[PDB]
Design a protein around this ligand. Sequence first.
Ligand SMILES: Nc1ncnc2c1ncn2[C@@H]1O[C@H](CSCC[C@H](N)C(=O)O)[C@@H](O)[C@H]1O
Length: 212
Amino acid sequence: AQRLDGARFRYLNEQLYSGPSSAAQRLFQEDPEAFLLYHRGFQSQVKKWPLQPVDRIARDLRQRPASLVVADFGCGDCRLASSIRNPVHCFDLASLDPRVTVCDMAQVPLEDESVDVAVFCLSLMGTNIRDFLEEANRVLKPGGLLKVAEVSSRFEDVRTFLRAVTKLGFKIVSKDLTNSHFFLFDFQKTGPPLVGPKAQLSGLQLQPCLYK
Ligand SMILES: Nc1ncnc2c1ncn2[C@@H]1O[C@H](CSCC[C@H](N)C(=O)O)[C@@H](O)[C@H]1O
């Protein structure tokens, strides 16, 4: 049974990285128990990490004024919102928490330049990663902060990933590669994307997180 839930999780997990966000959204809409499975599995993984990226991100944000408006892109169970006093917009494909605004984070119900900080904490799952980051750019005020955490094994070439993100109107401010389980990148918004919506951007193609 325990071995089965993990097999199930590992299959679903691999599936979630393999398709566009529309696929993941449909799956969770039609099969909400799959969402429960995913998070049972995800929690079993992050429990064994000395420090979760949400907590590291919360620590960062607690050092800045709590008036900064945060968007948590792929918020899961909203530990970020629970950990900071900021206004935190919580977006995910399905809801484990009453603060969740259910949507594809490629298209969130916020105005342009409405947020100070966009967070992607282990959430850049679908193949259409460009969509997520462009939506982050849209909602971010000029000079706003983008924080990205992903498992390090997802990055076969950090250099090109960072280069591609820069093409979407961001500047790297710092990167923390010191945690053994994830890389954390802080970018600041310089403006709108500087490659048109028909440019290629291969640097964004990440490897799936396979949890060991
Ligand atoms: N396109 C999308 N739109 C909204 N949420 C998405 C999404 N793609 C992935 N997610 C969400 O991203 C989450 C990844 S697990 C990480 C959850 C949370 N940030 C934490 O650190 O605890 C899942 O809840 C998943 O449903």
